[PDB]
Scaffold this active site. Structure first.
Site, PDB file in Angstrom:
ATOM      1  N   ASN A 180       0.847  -1.226   0.000  1.00 50.64           N
ATOM      2  CA  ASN A 180       0.000   0.000   0.000  1.00 50.64           C
ATOM      3  C   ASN A 180       0.873   1.264   0.000  1.00 50.64           C
ATOM      4  O   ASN A 180       0.318   2.369   0.152  1.00 50.64           O
ATOM      5  CB  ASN A 180      -0.978  -0.037   1.174  1.00 50.64           C
ATOM      6  CG  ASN A 180      -1.734  -1.351   1.246  1.00 50.64           C
ATOM      7  OD1 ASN A 180      -2.399  -1.753   0.291  1.00 50.64           O
ATOM      8  ND2 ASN A 180      -1.632  -2.041   2.370  1.00 50.64           N
ATOM      9  N   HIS A 182       2.768   2.334   2.149  1.00 54.57           N
ATOM     10  CA  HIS A 182       3.032   2.770   3.538  1.00 54.57           C
ATOM     11  C   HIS A 182       4.348   2.156   4.015  1.00 54.57           C
ATOM     12  O   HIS A 182       4.666   1.001   3.639  1.00 54.57           O
ATOM     13  CB  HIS A 182       1.872   2.376   4.455  1.00 54.57           C
ATOM     14  CG  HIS A 182       0.656   3.203   4.201  1.00 54.57           C
ATOM     15  ND1 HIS A 182       0.229   4.182   5.079  1.00 54.57           N
ATOM     16  CD2 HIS A 182      -0.218   3.210   3.171  1.00 54.57           C
ATOM     17  CE1 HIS A 182      -0.857   4.754   4.594  1.00 54.57           C
ATOM     18  NE2 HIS A 182      -1.150   4.177   3.421  1.00 54.57           N
ATOM     19  N   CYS A 217       4.240   7.269  10.128  1.00 54.78           N
ATOM     20  CA  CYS A 217       5.318   8.000   9.386  1.00 54.78           C
ATOM     21  C   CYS A 217       5.245   7.838   7.833  1.00 54.78           C
ATOM     22  O   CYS A 217       4.640   6.818   7.440  1.00 54.78           O
ATOM     23  CB  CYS A 217       6.617   7.429   9.918  1.00 54.78           C
ATOM     24  SG  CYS A 217       8.003   7.615   8.793  1.00 54.78           S
TER      25      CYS A 217
END
Ligand SMILES: Cc1ccccc1CO[C@@H]1C[C@@]2(C(C)C)CC[C@]1(C)O2
Ligand SMILES: Cc1ccccc1CO[C@@H]1C[C@@]2(C(C)C)CC[C@]1(C)O2
Lengths: 258, 258
Positions: A180, A182, A217
Protein backbone atom coordinates in the site's frame (compact mmCIF):
# COMPACT_ATOMS: atom_id res chain seq x y z
CA UNK A 1 -0.52 -22.71 7.21
CA UNK A 2 -4.16 -23.15 8.10
CA UNK A 3 -6.95 -22.34 10.48
CA UNK A 4 -7.07 -24.77 13.41
CA UNK A 5 -9.91 -27.34 13.77
CA UNK A 6 -12.17 -24.93 15.73
CA UNK A 7 -11.61 -22.08 13.21
CA UNK A 8 -10.55 -19.60 15.96
CA UNK A 9 -6.75 -19.49 15.46
CA UNK A 10 -4.25 -19.93 12.62
CA UNK A 11 -0.90 -21.75 12.53
CA UNK A 12 1.97 -21.49 10.05
CA UNK A 13 5.48 -22.97 9.91
CA UNK A 14 8.51 -21.08 8.62
CA UNK A 15 11.98 -22.46 7.74
CA UNK A 16 14.48 -19.75 8.84
CA UNK A 17 16.36 -18.49 5.73
CA UNK A 18 20.09 -17.68 5.46
CA UNK A 19 19.45 -13.97 4.80
CA UNK A 20 17.01 -13.74 7.78
CA UNK A 21 19.76 -14.32 10.43
CA UNK A 22 22.32 -11.97 12.06
CA UNK A 23 25.84 -12.51 13.53
CA UNK A 24 24.75 -15.21 16.09
CA UNK A 25 23.32 -17.24 13.14
CA UNK A 26 19.82 -16.82 14.58
CA UNK A 27 16.80 -15.00 13.15
CA UNK A 28 16.81 -11.21 13.71
CA UNK A 29 13.95 -9.62 15.67
CA UNK A 30 13.01 -7.86 12.36
CA UNK A 31 12.64 -11.30 10.74
CA UNK A 32 10.47 -12.38 13.70
CA UNK A 33 8.28 -9.24 13.32
CA UNK A 34 7.91 -9.91 9.57
CA UNK A 35 6.81 -13.50 10.33
CA UNK A 36 4.25 -12.20 12.91
CA UNK A 37 2.80 -9.88 10.21
CA UNK A 38 2.78 -12.71 7.58
CA UNK A 39 0.90 -15.23 9.78
CA UNK A 40 -1.54 -12.39 10.73
CA UNK A 41 -2.14 -11.53 7.05
CA UNK A 42 -2.67 -15.24 6.16
CA UNK A 43 -5.12 -15.55 9.10
CA UNK A 44 -7.05 -12.49 7.80
CA UNK A 45 -7.18 -13.95 4.26
CA UNK A 46 -8.31 -17.38 5.63
CA UNK A 47 -11.51 -15.77 7.14
CA UNK A 48 -12.32 -13.54 4.07
CA UNK A 49 -10.92 -10.07 5.14
CA UNK A 50 -8.07 -9.42 2.58
CA UNK A 51 -5.93 -6.09 -1.36
CA UNK A 52 -3.20 -5.11 1.21
CA UNK A 53 -5.73 -3.99 3.85
CA UNK A 54 -7.42 -6.58 5.98
CA UNK A 55 -10.87 -5.01 6.43
CA UNK A 56 -14.35 -6.12 7.44
CA UNK A 57 -17.31 -5.22 5.16
CA UNK A 58 -18.36 -2.21 7.30
CA UNK A 59 -14.71 -1.06 7.66
CA UNK A 60 -14.40 -0.98 3.82
CA UNK A 61 -17.69 0.99 3.51
CA UNK A 62 -16.38 3.58 6.10
CA UNK A 63 -12.77 3.76 4.76
CA UNK A 64 -11.44 2.32 8.05
CA UNK A 65 -8.25 0.36 8.48
CA UNK A 66 -6.59 -1.34 11.46
CA UNK A 67 -3.42 0.48 12.64
CA UNK A 68 -1.02 -0.70 15.36
CA UNK A 69 -1.30 1.19 18.68
CA UNK A 70 1.01 -1.12 20.69
CA UNK A 71 3.33 -4.05 19.91
CA UNK A 72 4.89 -6.19 22.66
CA UNK A 73 7.28 -9.03 21.76
CA UNK A 74 9.21 -11.38 24.13
CA UNK A 75 11.75 -13.83 22.65
CA UNK A 76 13.23 -16.62 24.79
CA UNK A 77 15.26 -18.20 21.93
CA UNK A 78 15.82 -16.95 18.35
CA UNK A 79 15.63 -19.78 15.81
CA UNK A 80 18.71 -20.75 13.62
CA UNK A 81 19.06 -20.91 9.73
CA UNK A 82 17.23 -24.11 8.70
CA UNK A 83 15.19 -24.32 11.96
CA UNK A 84 11.40 -24.68 11.66
CA UNK A 85 9.36 -22.24 13.78
CA UNK A 86 5.59 -22.64 14.14
CA UNK A 87 3.59 -19.50 14.96
CA UNK A 88 -0.02 -19.65 16.23
CA UNK A 89 -2.05 -16.42 16.13
CA UNK A 90 -5.53 -15.36 17.18
CA UNK A 91 -7.49 -12.20 17.89
CA UNK A 92 -9.90 -10.99 20.56
CA UNK A 93 -12.30 -8.07 20.75
CA UNK A 94 -11.24 -5.13 22.99
CA UNK A 95 -14.82 -3.78 23.06
CA UNK A 96 -14.99 -0.28 21.58
CA UNK A 97 -11.23 0.31 22.04
CA UNK A 98 -9.93 -1.93 19.24
CA UNK A 99 -8.76 -5.43 18.51
CA UNK A 100 -6.01 -7.57 20.09
CA UNK A 101 -3.80 -9.94 18.06
CA UNK A 102 -1.64 -12.45 19.98
CA UNK A 103 1.01 -14.88 18.82
CA UNK A 104 2.93 -17.86 20.27
CA UNK A 105 6.17 -19.05 18.64
CA UNK A 106 7.35 -22.64 19.06
CA UNK A 107 10.33 -24.69 17.94
CA UNK A 108 8.48 -27.25 15.74
CA UNK A 109 10.90 -30.07 16.78
CA UNK A 110 10.86 -29.73 20.65
CA UNK A 111 7.36 -28.12 20.83
CA UNK A 112 8.86 -25.62 23.33
CA UNK A 113 7.54 -22.05 23.34
CA UNK A 114 10.40 -19.85 22.13
CA UNK A 115 8.53 -16.49 22.02
CA UNK A 116 5.25 -14.63 22.52
CA UNK A 117 3.70 -11.42 21.26
CA UNK A 118 0.62 -9.27 21.76
CA UNK A 119 -0.59 -6.21 19.91
CA UNK A 120 -3.38 -3.65 20.14
CA UNK A 121 -4.83 -2.45 16.84
CA UNK A 122 -7.27 0.49 16.53
CA UNK A 123 -9.65 1.72 13.77
CA UNK A 124 -8.40 4.74 11.76
CA UNK A 125 -10.01 6.49 8.79
CA UNK A 126 -7.45 5.79 6.03
CA UNK A 127 -7.82 9.31 4.51
CA UNK A 128 -7.85 11.57 7.59
CA UNK A 129 -5.78 9.31 9.94
CA UNK A 130 -8.35 10.05 12.72
CA UNK A 131 -8.81 7.28 15.24
CA UNK A 132 -12.27 5.78 15.63
CA UNK A 133 -13.95 3.42 18.11
CA UNK A 134 -15.09 -0.06 17.05
CA UNK A 135 -18.82 0.02 16.21
CA UNK A 136 -21.15 -2.92 16.92
CA UNK A 137 -21.39 -3.52 13.14
CA UNK A 138 -17.58 -3.93 12.80
CA UNK A 139 -17.18 -5.94 16.04
CA UNK A 140 -20.06 -8.26 15.01
CA UNK A 141 -18.34 -8.92 11.65
CA UNK A 142 -15.10 -10.17 13.24
CA UNK A 143 -16.30 -11.58 16.61
CA UNK A 144 -17.29 -14.86 14.92
CA UNK A 145 -13.56 -15.41 14.10
CA UNK A 146 -12.32 -14.88 17.71
CA UNK A 147 -12.29 -16.90 20.91
CA UNK A 148 -14.78 -15.05 23.18
CA UNK A 149 -13.44 -16.25 26.56
CA UNK A 150 -9.98 -14.97 27.45
CA UNK A 151 -6.97 -16.43 25.67
CA UNK A 152 -3.83 -14.36 26.43
CA UNK A 153 -0.34 -14.92 25.02
CA UNK A 154 0.89 -13.05 28.12
CA UNK A 155 2.80 3.85 30.47
CA UNK A 156 6.01 4.34 28.43
CA UNK A 157 7.51 7.74 29.40
CA UNK A 158 8.81 10.34 26.94
CA UNK A 159 12.62 10.36 26.49
CA UNK A 160 14.03 13.64 27.85
CA UNK A 161 16.68 15.77 26.11
CA UNK A 162 19.52 15.12 25.88
CA UNK A 163 19.40 11.59 24.40
CA UNK A 164 22.34 9.31 25.39
CA UNK A 165 22.45 7.80 21.86
CA UNK A 166 21.04 8.76 18.45
CA UNK A 167 20.84 7.72 14.84
CA UNK A 168 19.60 10.72 12.86
CA UNK A 169 18.55 11.24 9.28
CA UNK A 170 17.09 7.74 8.91
CA UNK A 171 15.21 7.56 5.61
CA UNK A 172 13.14 4.64 4.32
CA UNK A 173 14.02 3.13 0.91
CA UNK A 174 11.40 1.55 -1.37
CA UNK A 175 12.07 -1.90 0.24
CA UNK A 176 10.64 -0.42 3.53
CA UNK A 177 7.19 0.26 1.92
CA UNK A 178 4.38 -2.33 1.95
CA UNK A 179 2.01 -3.20 -0.93
CA UNK A 180 0.00 0.00 0.00
CA UNK A 181 3.17 2.24 -0.26
CA UNK A 182 3.03 2.77 3.54
CA UNK A 183 6.26 2.38 5.57
CA UNK A 184 6.22 -1.22 6.91
CA UNK A 185 5.76 -1.28 10.72
CA UNK A 186 8.85 -3.61 11.19
CA UNK A 187 10.85 -0.65 9.87
CA UNK A 188 10.06 1.11 13.20
CA UNK A 189 11.67 -1.79 15.14
CA UNK A 190 14.76 -1.57 12.93
CA UNK A 191 14.94 2.24 13.43
CA UNK A 192 14.66 1.88 17.25
CA UNK A 193 17.55 -0.65 17.29
CA UNK A 194 19.78 1.58 15.05
CA UNK A 195 20.48 3.93 18.01
CA UNK A 196 21.49 1.02 20.35
CA UNK A 197 25.33 0.97 20.59
CA UNK A 198 27.10 -1.73 18.50
CA UNK A 199 28.86 -3.00 21.71
CA UNK A 200 25.41 -3.78 23.30
CA UNK A 201 24.17 -5.54 20.09
CA UNK A 202 27.48 -7.52 19.92
CA UNK A 203 27.29 -8.73 23.58
CA UNK A 204 23.50 -8.96 24.29
CA UNK A 205 20.31 -10.44 22.80
CA UNK A 206 16.98 -8.59 22.74
CA UNK A 207 14.52 -10.27 25.17
CA UNK A 208 11.57 -7.79 25.20
CA UNK A 209 10.48 -4.87 23.01
CA UNK A 210 7.42 -2.71 23.63
CA UNK A 211 6.50 -0.02 21.09
CA UNK A 212 3.70 2.55 21.26
CA UNK A 213 2.68 3.98 17.85
CA UNK A 214 1.50 7.61 18.16
CA UNK A 215 1.33 8.80 14.55
CA UNK A 216 2.19 6.83 11.38
CA UNK A 217 5.32 8.00 9.39
CA UNK A 218 5.76 8.79 5.48
CA UNK A 219 7.99 8.01 2.38
CA UNK A 220 9.46 11.57 1.99
CA UNK A 221 10.23 11.89 5.75
CA UNK A 222 13.37 11.74 7.87
CA UNK A 223 13.33 10.18 11.34
CA UNK A 224 15.63 10.49 14.32
CA UNK A 225 16.04 7.42 16.57
CA UNK A 226 16.84 8.45 20.18
CA UNK A 227 17.86 6.06 22.98
CA UNK A 228 18.79 6.43 26.66
CA UNK A 229 19.84 3.65 29.07
CA UNK A 230 17.38 3.21 32.01
CA UNK A 231 19.24 0.30 33.81
CA UNK A 232 20.36 -7.06 31.89
CA UNK A 233 20.40 -3.78 29.89
CA UNK A 234 17.23 -1.65 29.60
CA UNK A 235 16.58 1.31 27.24
CA UNK A 236 14.00 4.01 26.60
CA UNK A 237 13.37 4.89 22.93
CA UNK A 238 11.78 7.77 21.01
CA UNK A 239 11.32 8.09 17.22
CA UNK A 240 10.50 11.64 16.11
CA UNK A 241 10.38 13.51 12.79
CA UNK A 242 13.58 15.39 11.79
CA UNK A 243 13.94 18.99 12.99
CA UNK A 244 12.66 18.31 16.55
CA UNK A 245 9.31 17.39 14.92
CA UNK A 246 6.39 15.23 16.04
CA UNK A 247 6.80 11.95 17.99
CA UNK A 248 6.17 8.84 15.77
CA UNK A 249 6.96 6.02 18.31
CA UNK A 250 8.13 5.52 21.90
CA UNK A 251 9.30 2.24 23.33
CA UNK A 252 11.39 0.18 25.72
CA UNK A 253 13.79 -2.73 25.21
CA UNK A 254 15.24 -5.29 27.61
CA UNK A 255 18.49 -7.07 26.67
CA UNK A 256 20.08 -10.28 28.15
CA UNK A 257 23.89 -10.97 27.97
CA UNK A 258 24.82 -13.70 25.37
CA UNK B 1 14.17 -28.08 -1.21
CA UNK B 2 16.53 -30.81 -2.32
CA UNK B 3 19.22 -31.89 -4.72
CA UNK B 4 17.76 -33.37 -7.91
CA UNK B 5 18.04 -37.12 -8.69
CA UNK B 6 21.43 -36.74 -10.47
CA UNK B 7 22.88 -34.61 -7.61
CA UNK B 8 23.95 -31.80 -10.01
CA UNK B 9 21.27 -29.15 -9.32
CA UNK B 10 19.04 -28.06 -6.44
CA UNK B 11 15.35 -27.05 -6.40
CA UNK B 12 13.36 -25.17 -3.77
CA UNK B 13 9.79 -23.81 -3.65
CA UNK B 14 8.86 -20.50 -2.00
CA UNK B 15 5.37 -19.19 -1.12
CA UNK B 16 5.49 -15.41 -1.80
CA UNK B 17 4.86 -13.56 1.52
CA UNK B 18 2.73 -10.43 2.06
CA UNK B 19 5.72 -8.31 3.11
CA UNK B 20 7.78 -9.49 0.07
CA UNK B 21 5.52 -7.70 -2.50
CA UNK B 22 5.38 -4.07 -3.73
CA UNK B 23 2.53 -1.84 -5.09
CA UNK B 24 1.57 -4.22 -7.99
CA UNK B 25 1.06 -7.01 -5.36
CA UNK B 26 3.94 -8.96 -6.91
CA UNK B 27 7.31 -9.92 -5.42
CA UNK B 28 9.95 -7.15 -5.53
CA UNK B 29 13.20 -7.77 -7.43
CA UNK B 30 14.94 -7.54 -3.99
CA UNK B 31 12.75 -10.44 -2.79
CA UNK B 32 13.71 -12.37 -5.95
CA UNK B 33 17.44 -11.69 -5.32
CA UNK B 34 17.07 -12.85 -1.69
CA UNK B 35 15.41 -16.08 -2.91
CA UNK B 36 18.27 -16.63 -5.44
CA UNK B 37 20.80 -16.30 -2.56
CA UNK B 38 18.74 -18.63 -0.27
CA UNK B 39 18.44 -21.47 -2.84
CA UNK B 40 22.21 -21.03 -3.57
CA UNK B 41 23.07 -21.25 0.16
CA UNK B 42 20.84 -24.37 0.59
CA UNK B 43 22.53 -25.94 -2.48
CA UNK B 44 25.98 -25.25 -0.93
CA UNK B 45 24.89 -26.79 2.41
CA UNK B 46 23.40 -29.85 0.60
CA UNK B 47 26.89 -30.75 -0.85
CA UNK B 48 28.88 -30.07 2.41
CA UNK B 49 30.32 -26.51 1.82
CA UNK B 50 28.60 -24.37 4.56
CA UNK B 51 29.17 -20.97 8.95
CA UNK B 52 28.00 -18.08 6.64
CA UNK B 53 30.73 -18.74 4.03
CA UNK B 54 30.25 -21.50 1.54
CA UNK B 55 33.85 -22.72 1.12
CA UNK B 56 35.63 -25.80 -0.18
CA UNK B 57 38.28 -27.47 2.06
CA UNK B 58 41.21 -25.81 0.23
CA UNK B 59 39.40 -22.42 0.17
CA UNK B 60 39.05 -22.59 4.01
CA UNK B 61 42.77 -23.49 4.39
CA UNK B 62 43.74 -20.44 2.17
CA UNK B 63 41.20 -17.97 3.69
CA UNK B 64 39.40 -17.70 0.32
CA UNK B 65 35.76 -16.84 -0.18
CA UNK B 66 33.53 -16.56 -3.25
CA UNK B 67 32.56 -12.94 -4.07
CA UNK B 68 30.14 -11.80 -6.79
CA UNK B 69 31.81 -10.27 -9.88
CA UNK B 70 28.63 -10.09 -12.03
CA UNK B 71 24.91 -10.66 -11.49
CA UNK B 72 22.42 -10.79 -14.39
CA UNK B 73 18.70 -11.26 -13.72
CA UNK B 74 15.79 -11.33 -16.25
CA UNK B 75 12.20 -11.49 -14.94
CA UNK B 76 9.30 -12.21 -17.32
CA UNK B 77 6.61 -12.25 -14.57
CA UNK B 78 6.90 -11.39 -10.85
CA UNK B 79 4.96 -13.83 -8.66
CA UNK B 80 1.97 -12.64 -6.46
CA UNK B 81 1.43 -12.96 -2.60
CA UNK B 82 0.49 -16.62 -2.03
CA UNK B 83 1.97 -17.81 -5.38
CA UNK B 84 4.43 -20.72 -5.30
CA UNK B 85 7.69 -20.15 -7.22
CA UNK B 86 10.14 -23.00 -7.80
CA UNK B 87 13.80 -22.06 -8.34
CA UNK B 88 16.35 -24.52 -9.79
CA UNK B 89 20.04 -23.63 -9.41
CA UNK B 90 23.33 -25.16 -10.50
CA UNK B 91 26.96 -24.18 -10.93
CA UNK B 92 29.66 -24.68 -13.55
CA UNK B 93 33.42 -24.24 -13.51
CA UNK B 94 34.80 -21.16 -15.34
CA UNK B 95 38.31 -22.66 -15.43
CA UNK B 96 40.79 -20.46 -13.57
CA UNK B 97 38.51 -17.38 -13.78
CA UNK B 98 35.90 -18.40 -11.20
CA UNK B 99 32.60 -20.17 -10.82
CA UNK B 100 29.20 -19.60 -12.51
CA UNK B 101 25.87 -20.00 -10.66
CA UNK B 102 22.68 -20.08 -12.75
CA UNK B 103 19.03 -20.10 -11.76
CA UNK B 104 15.65 -20.74 -13.46
CA UNK B 105 12.42 -19.53 -11.82
CA UNK B 106 9.10 -21.22 -12.59
CA UNK B 107 5.49 -20.76 -11.59
CA UNK B 108 4.95 -24.11 -9.79
CA UNK B 109 1.30 -24.33 -11.03
CA UNK B 110 1.74 -23.67 -14.83
CA UNK B 111 5.39 -24.92 -14.98
CA UNK B 112 6.15 -21.81 -17.10
CA UNK B 113 9.58 -20.18 -16.77
CA UNK B 114 8.98 -16.76 -15.19
CA UNK B 115 12.65 -15.69 -14.77
CA UNK B 116 16.32 -16.57 -15.21
CA UNK B 117 19.60 -15.50 -13.66
CA UNK B 118 23.33 -16.04 -14.05
CA UNK B 119 26.23 -14.91 -11.92
CA UNK B 120 30.03 -14.98 -11.99
CA UNK B 121 31.75 -15.52 -8.64
CA UNK B 122 35.52 -15.15 -8.10
CA UNK B 123 37.96 -16.23 -5.34
CA UNK B 124 39.06 -13.44 -2.94
CA UNK B 125 41.29 -13.65 0.14
CA UNK B 126 38.84 -12.70 2.91
CA UNK B 127 41.46 -10.62 4.81
CA UNK B 128 43.20 -8.68 2.01
CA UNK B 129 40.25 -8.59 -0.48
CA UNK B 130 42.75 -9.52 -3.28
CA UNK B 131 41.27 -11.52 -6.12
CA UNK B 132 42.74 -14.94 -6.84
CA UNK B 133 42.43 -17.50 -9.65
CA UNK B 134 40.80 -20.89 -9.05
CA UNK B 135 43.50 -23.51 -8.38
CA UNK B 136 43.18 -27.14 -9.53
CA UNK B 137 42.76 -28.17 -5.86
CA UNK B 138 39.72 -25.86 -5.40
CA UNK B 139 38.19 -26.64 -8.82
CA UNK B 140 38.61 -30.41 -8.20
CA UNK B 141 36.76 -30.07 -4.86
CA UNK B 142 33.64 -28.54 -6.43
CA UNK B 143 33.68 -29.98 -9.99
CA UNK B 144 32.04 -33.21 -8.74
CA UNK B 145 28.93 -31.11 -7.82
CA UNK B 146 28.58 -29.46 -11.28
CA UNK B 147 27.31 -30.51 -14.68
CA UNK B 148 30.49 -30.66 -16.85
CA UNK B 149 28.85 -30.19 -20.27
CA UNK B 150 27.29 -26.78 -20.85
CA UNK B 151 24.03 -25.95 -19.10
CA UNK B 152 23.23 -22.21 -19.48
CA UNK B 153 20.26 -20.36 -17.98
CA UNK B 154 20.81 -17.82 -20.79
CA UNK B 155 31.24 -4.18 -21.08
CA UNK B 156 29.17 -1.84 -18.86
CA UNK B 157 30.49 1.73 -19.35
CA UNK B 158 31.24 4.20 -16.56
CA UNK B 159 28.49 6.80 -15.93
CA UNK B 160 29.80 10.27 -16.84
CA UNK B 161 29.29 13.42 -14.75
CA UNK B 162 26.78 14.89 -14.46
CA UNK B 163 24.36 12.12 -13.40
CA UNK B 164 20.71 12.65 -14.50
CA UNK B 165 19.42 11.24 -11.17
CA UNK B 166 20.94 10.56 -7.74
CA UNK B 167 20.20 9.27 -4.29
CA UNK B 168 23.07 10.32 -2.04
CA UNK B 169 24.03 9.55 1.52
CA UNK B 170 22.63 6.00 1.42
CA UNK B 171 23.71 4.19 4.59
CA UNK B 172 23.13 0.53 5.44
CA UNK B 173 21.29 -0.33 8.68
CA UNK B 174 21.98 -3.53 10.65
CA UNK B 175 19.18 -5.34 8.68
CA UNK B 176 21.39 -4.89 5.52
CA UNK B 177 24.27 -6.99 7.03
CA UNK B 178 24.50 -10.77 6.58
CA UNK B 179 25.48 -13.36 9.23
CA UNK B 180 29.18 -12.37 8.58
CA UNK B 181 28.44 -8.61 9.24
CA UNK B 182 29.08 -7.89 5.53
CA UNK B 183 26.57 -5.70 3.62
CA UNK B 184 24.17 -8.14 1.87
CA UNK B 185 24.64 -8.06 -1.93
CA UNK B 186 20.83 -7.52 -2.53
CA UNK B 187 21.37 -4.19 -0.78
CA UNK B 188 23.32 -3.10 -3.93
CA UNK B 189 20.24 -3.83 -6.11
CA UNK B 190 18.06 -1.78 -3.75
CA UNK B 191 20.59 1.11 -3.80
CA UNK B 192 20.72 1.10 -7.64
CA UNK B 193 16.89 1.31 -7.84
CA UNK B 194 16.72 4.18 -5.25
CA UNK B 195 17.98 6.68 -7.89
CA UNK B 196 15.35 5.58 -10.50
CA UNK B 197 12.56 8.23 -10.57
CA UNK B 198 9.32 7.28 -8.72
CA UNK B 199 7.32 7.96 -11.97
CA UNK B 200 9.34 5.21 -13.80
CA UNK B 201 8.87 2.72 -10.87
CA UNK B 202 5.11 3.58 -10.77
CA UNK B 203 4.57 3.01 -14.56
CA UNK B 204 7.18 0.31 -15.46
CA UNK B 205 8.39 -3.13 -14.31
CA UNK B 206 12.06 -4.12 -14.18
CA UNK B 207 12.78 -6.74 -16.90
CA UNK B 208 16.62 -7.01 -16.79
CA UNK B 209 19.33 -5.94 -14.32
CA UNK B 210 23.06 -6.44 -14.84
CA UNK B 211 25.46 -5.46 -12.05
CA UNK B 212 29.26 -5.54 -12.06
CA UNK B 213 30.83 -5.62 -8.55
CA UNK B 214 34.21 -3.81 -8.49
CA UNK B 215 34.99 -3.50 -4.79
CA UNK B 216 32.86 -4.68 -1.83
CA UNK B 217 31.32 -1.90 0.43
CA UNK B 218 31.37 -1.48 4.42
CA UNK B 219 29.08 -0.85 7.51
CA UNK B 220 30.46 2.65 8.38
CA UNK B 221 30.30 3.85 4.72
CA UNK B 222 28.04 6.16 2.74
CA UNK B 223 27.15 5.42 -0.88
CA UNK B 224 25.84 7.57 -3.70
CA UNK B 225 23.53 5.93 -6.27
CA UNK B 226 23.83 7.63 -9.69
CA UNK B 227 21.58 6.96 -12.70
CA UNK B 228 21.33 8.29 -16.26
CA UNK B 229 18.76 7.31 -18.93
CA UNK B 230 20.37 5.63 -22.01
CA UNK B 231 17.10 5.05 -24.04
CA UNK B 232 11.11 0.36 -22.93
CA UNK B 233 13.26 2.49 -20.57
CA UNK B 234 17.00 1.79 -20.18
CA UNK B 235 19.41 3.17 -17.53
CA UNK B 236 23.10 3.24 -16.70
CA UNK B 237 24.00 3.01 -12.99
CA UNK B 238 27.05 3.74 -10.83
CA UNK B 239 27.42 3.21 -7.05
CA UNK B 240 30.42 5.04 -5.58
CA UNK B 241 31.64 5.92 -2.08
CA UNK B 242 30.59 9.36 -0.72
CA UNK B 243 32.88 12.31 -1.47
CA UNK B 244 33.49 11.35 -5.15
CA UNK B 245 35.20 8.19 -3.80
CA UNK B 246 35.86 4.75 -5.29
CA UNK B 247 33.39 2.93 -7.58
CA UNK B 248 31.58 0.02 -5.76
CA UNK B 249 29.18 -1.16 -8.58
CA UNK B 250 28.16 -0.29 -12.14
CA UNK B 251 25.11 -1.64 -13.88
CA UNK B 252 22.29 -1.40 -16.39
CA UNK B 253 18.53 -1.87 -16.11
CA UNK B 254 15.82 -2.41 -18.72
CA UNK B 255 12.20 -1.55 -17.84
CA UNK B 256 8.91 -2.55 -19.60
CA UNK B 257 5.67 -0.44 -19.33
CA UNK B 258 3.00 -2.04 -17.02
C1 LIG C 1 -9.97 -9.59 13.77
C2 LIG C 1 -9.55 -10.84 13.07
C3 LIG C 1 -10.00 -12.08 13.56
C4 LIG C 1 -9.61 -13.26 12.92
C5 LIG C 1 -8.81 -13.21 11.77
C6 LIG C 1 -8.38 -11.99 11.30
C7 LIG C 1 -8.77 -10.80 11.92
C8 LIG C 1 -8.22 -9.52 11.38
O1 LIG C 1 -7.02 -9.19 12.05
C9 LIG C 1 -6.38 -8.01 11.54
C10 LIG C 1 -5.35 -8.32 10.48
C11 LIG C 1 -4.03 -7.91 11.18
C12 LIG C 1 -2.78 -8.67 10.75
C13 LIG C 1 -2.48 -8.45 9.26
C14 LIG C 1 -1.57 -8.37 11.61
C15 LIG C 1 -3.94 -6.37 11.19
C16 LIG C 1 -5.04 -6.02 12.20
C17 LIG C 1 -5.54 -7.40 12.64
C18 LIG C 1 -6.13 -7.47 14.04
O2 LIG C 1 -4.35 -8.19 12.56
C1 LIG D 1 30.37 -24.52 -6.65
C2 LIG D 1 29.17 -25.20 -6.09
C3 LIG D 1 28.65 -26.33 -6.73
C4 LIG D 1 27.53 -26.97 -6.21
C5 LIG D 1 26.93 -26.52 -5.03
C6 LIG D 1 27.44 -25.41 -4.40
C7 LIG D 1 28.58 -24.76 -4.90
C8 LIG D 1 29.05 -23.53 -4.19
O1 LIG D 1 28.44 -22.39 -4.76
C9 LIG D 1 28.76 -21.16 -4.10
C10 LIG D 1 27.76 -20.79 -3.02
C11 LIG D 1 27.12 -19.50 -3.62
C12 LIG D 1 25.68 -19.23 -3.21
C13 LIG D 1 25.54 -19.04 -1.70
C14 LIG D 1 25.06 -18.08 -3.98
C15 LIG D 1 28.13 -18.35 -3.45
C16 LIG D 1 29.21 -18.74 -4.45
C17 LIG D 1 28.64 -20.02 -5.07
C18 LIG D 1 29.08 -20.32 -6.50
O2 LIG D 1 27.23 -19.77 -5.02
Amino acid sequence: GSLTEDGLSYKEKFVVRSYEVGSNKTATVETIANLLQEVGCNHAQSVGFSDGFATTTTMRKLHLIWVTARMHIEIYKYPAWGDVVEIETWCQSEGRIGTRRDWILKDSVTGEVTGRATSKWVMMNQDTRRLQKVSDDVRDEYLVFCPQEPRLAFKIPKLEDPAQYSMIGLKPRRADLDMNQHVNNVTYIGWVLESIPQEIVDTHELQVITLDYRRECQQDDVVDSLTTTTSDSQFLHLLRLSGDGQEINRGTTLWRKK
